[PDB]
Design a protein around this ligand. Structure first.
Ligand SMILES: NC(=O)c1cc[n+](COC[n+]2ccccc2/C=N/O)cc1
Ligand SMILES: NC(=O)c1cc[n+](COC[n+]2ccccc2/C=N/O)cc1
Ligand SMILES: *[C@@H]1O[C@H](CO)[C@@H](O)[C@H](O)[C@H]1NC(C)=O
Lengths: 533, 541
């Protein structure tokens, strides 16, 4: 089948014809885009894949980058759907491509997915990242890469030659170059490339916006539930050096000698200890993440968004209704997926220190005082829902509002949303609402698969979202360019702050993304922590 | 004595009085005006605790109001009724310790519950003789016995060199206490029940009422209390001993003056010299701050009102407290640039930040930033209309609404039966612009039942409404409960409690129960702000 045979710069590939509910798609899975980052290449920037002979089999997903595997609720669908679904290996630098079948006759907009997982986990092979739906229904070319996570991708001894940090983002960048060089062979348009990602994937997309060498490799960006700015996505050079030095201590190890010993260590030994280097007991905080190196990131993301020129940029950003709930069951006492998680006031104060682990006593009190309902100060249902809002606002919603506003003020075309539909098939309890990560299956169009037991209105809703996202990819505007009839999705601006709700009902335009509450986080808290240092 | 009206002659402890028969809309009332209750606090007695009035001979004429206590007179809007209604309507004198009594005509058969009014005016102004404090309507329509007293204001009432013998502070409060004692001894001669005495006051008068609650020797002189738009706790009603000393000393300097020598020199100064300089000793440019106010002396006030209301036992006490809808607006047009009674007062963001520093004069920079961040509308951070209204709310919340919430909460948690209200009707006769809403002091005329006087041009609805307010107040004085026992159908006013936090709206519509007295914002002022001020050293004070 000639539709499954493709020649790229490195040699020949054989893909596989897949069935999507509406017809066939061409899938080329497991394409190597870098030399395996193994042995002495551990912690090093990726190198381009050497050319191969014959026809490389690209009909199956490749290994998942070595990472921690979650065991909190063993074999529960809601946690397992994020766990690695292929073998673990440091040899994991591969990407995946879906195209229409037959291959598009005209050059077609490319979407490039970057998974999240807190920079410590994730894989492009998960079912919720299946590209066949967007390829089949919308005729998109869709690309996803694996990139190194945890210590392997982000352990940094800033200034060292052998662990300069940010190599996981360098993996992404290399995959982006690969798309520039090769996507035309699959019928993709390299002059129309849209990055999209969720949570740490969104933050990664954010870093690419903020890092010059990346800018020639894409045109538009979508950030779902994550930003390069904010309290979890980056660390200073000093804090990264501390964490890497501590980890080295934990496993038996000048910079060169230290990294050399680290390179001798079996992968599982590093994973065993990575989560022991956080300075405070926390949630929504991750041990090894992008570092302000003065290189990939020339300054902090805050500094860079405050001063950048984004005039040529189109960005779509958004959150889910209950960003915080998912994280509560992992670190905060009194929370569980198996009960209503009705907490006491005491447990609420305790939960705030954990959710805002960097806060002084006074800042922590300010948070408690802000989120307490003084009509019902001791009510367990309020306290529980408040706890979730604290985590979600502090980590996602307010950083997103900060980004949207800063980008809009500096020339970017910005569109913002909030996603409010809870999947009928969701396995988490009601009180968690619409948790972090559960818009993705809709954007990727999973409900269009009849065997997945989604409702029919959900199928219809999924098609709307794929339309918005791909319209955005095509044109930088999510609005259907020839469907009339209200309501249109207006651009987010600093003046009017318009965003839309994504749910089963038609678009509703709202103004202000938790404006009062995010003013507390974005404007007041920094002045506070500053003074109370 | 011989041909006069036999119903207007009464004897009190100090001698015989002749009162006057006044006309009220529904019938005659008895008034006894300008009854001395102290020796005149003049000469060597300036700044001193009041001494009880020595008995007189013959029949003291009690048919006209007496002198108003020496005070600063506001002149910002000359001839404008909005300011004039508050100005002195009798001669200014240090010889001003007199009180007034209104009773049914003829006097009541059986002992009648007594109401004692204490006027406001920032502890630097006021008089019991103003038209808005006319007791004739309450006396006539409700059968009430009403008493109001002049007390010393400004320096004469509140200048203190704490610890000294010659100027111990709080003598204005002691004037009020002496009048309360006078009521205990003498009110039965008018048909008043000394065993049923309810204090009420507005603004500084309310704070005064609160101080009698907190001061042991006052407690045996009354049984129930009403606090309208004012509290003894909060940022303006008291000053520390150190601050009172510093202000007394500065004022002394400004007029050309060991505490004995200083005070003695002050006693040689003309009353007007003192008044002309009193306002000049405030530590910052402010509004809703007053130069000479009750001092935490360790005597009348054994501790700060905040400490006292936190630890006090208040079981045998019933209290009615409340606020008007727009406590702050009145104060803006006096002291905050951008504000006026003559335009819409739409202000800039700059003018708003400047207004916050003036309205929260004790705030550190961060505290102020917190206030600004909390009151800013972040969807419209520079809208002149929201800014105007937020400035009003800042001043109202910080000074009245939140101190009131803190009071009702603490009293209720500690055994007092509390009733709370918000007053939301704007008089059709109001001369202030619409943007000011229902300003500080403008419920008073309804409580006293002025709309019952046809010649004042209130609406028929306003007359019925005033009648309603009068029932509430006198029912509360009568029984500790504003609800009418003989009225089941009509909506009930529930007690305020820490758990439910219920209060009622007072307007032209029937009572409506609401929950939470600006609960969210008052958490900022009452819980967070003081912790935030704690983090700052240099300076203020
Ligand atoms: N902050 C944490 O402790 C934590 C715990 C567990 N997970 C698991 O993430 C799974 N996941 C990964 C990607 C998107 C949604 C959900 C994340 C953070
Ligand atoms: N010496 C003072 O404390 C002082 C304070 C404020 N004002 C003028 O502004 C306030 N004000 C002005 C006019 C009428 C009433 C009021 C305050 N009532 O509480 C004059 C003197
Ligand atoms: C209203 O009048 C006052 C005094 O005349 C002035 O300070 C203020 O700026 C005026 N406001 C407007 C909006 O004209």
């Amino acid at each position: 089948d000639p539709q499954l045979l493709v020649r790229v710069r490195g040699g020949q590939l054989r893909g596989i014809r897949l069935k999507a509910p509406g017809g066939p798609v061409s899938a080329f899975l497991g394409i190597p885009f870098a030399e395996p980052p193994v042995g002495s290449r551990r912690f090093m920037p990726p190198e381009p894949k050497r050319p191969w002979s014959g026809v490389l089999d690209a009909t199956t997903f490749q290994n998942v980058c070595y990472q921690y595997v979650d065991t909190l609720y063993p074999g529960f669908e809601g946690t397992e759907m994020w766990n690695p679904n292929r073998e673990l290996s440091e040899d994991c630098l591969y990407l995946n491509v879906w195209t229409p079948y037959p291959r598009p006759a005209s050059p077609t907009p490319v979407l490039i997915w970057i998974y999240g997982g807190g920079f410590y986990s994730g894989a492009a092979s998960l079912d919720v990242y299946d590209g066949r739906f967007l390829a089949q229904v919308e005729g998109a070319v869709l690309v996803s890469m694996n990139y190194r996570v945890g210590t392997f991708g982000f352990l940094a001894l800033p200034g060292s030659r052998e662990a300069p940090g940010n190599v996981g983002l360098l993996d992404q960048r290399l995959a982006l170059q690969w798309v520039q060089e090769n996507i035309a062979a699959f019928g993709g348009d390299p002059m129309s490339v849209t990055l999209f990602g969720e949570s740490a994937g969104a933050a990664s997309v954010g870093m690419h916006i903020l890092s010059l060498p990346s800018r020639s490799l894409f045109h538009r960006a979508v950030l779902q539930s994550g930003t390069p700015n904010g309290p979890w996505a980056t660390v200073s050079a000093g804090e990264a050096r501390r964490r890497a030095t501590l980890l080295a201590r934990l496993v038996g190890c000048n910079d060169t000698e230290l990294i050399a010993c680290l390179r001798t260590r079996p992968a599982q030994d590093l994973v065993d200890h990575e989560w022991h280097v956080l300075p405070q007991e926390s949630i929504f905080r991750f041990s090894f993440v992008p570092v302000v190196d003065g290189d990939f990131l020339s300054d902090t993301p805050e500094a860079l968004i405050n001063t950048g020129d984004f005039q040529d940029l189109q960005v779509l950003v958004g959150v889910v209704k209950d960003e915080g709930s998912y994280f509560l069951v992992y670190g905060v006492p009194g929370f569980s997926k198996d009960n209503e998680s009705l907490i006491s006031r005491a447990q609420f104060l305790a939960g705030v220190r954990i959710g805002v682990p960097q806060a002084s006593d006074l800042a922590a009190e300010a948070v408690v005082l802000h989120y307490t309902d003084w009509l019902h100060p001791e009510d367990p249902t309020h306290l529980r829902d408040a706890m979730s809002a604290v985590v979600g606002d502090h980590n996602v919603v307010c950083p997103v509002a900060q980004l949207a506003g800063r980008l809009a003020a500096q020339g970017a075309r910005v569109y913002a949303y909030i996603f409010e539909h809870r999947a009928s098939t969701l396995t988490w309890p009601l009180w968690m609402g619409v948790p972090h990560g559960y818009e993705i299956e809709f954007i990727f169009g999973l409900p269009l698969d009849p065997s997945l037991n989604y409702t029919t209105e959900e199928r219809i809703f999924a098609q709307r979202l794929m339309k918005y996202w791909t319209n955005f990819a095509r044109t930088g505007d999510p609005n259907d360019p020839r469907d009339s009839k209200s309501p249109q999705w207006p651009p987010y601006t600093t003046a009017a702050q318009q965003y839309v709700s994504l749910n089963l009902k038609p678009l509703e335009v709202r103004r202000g993304l938790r404006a009062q509450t995010c003013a507390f986080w974005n404007r007041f808290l920094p002045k506070l922590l500053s003074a109370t240092a």
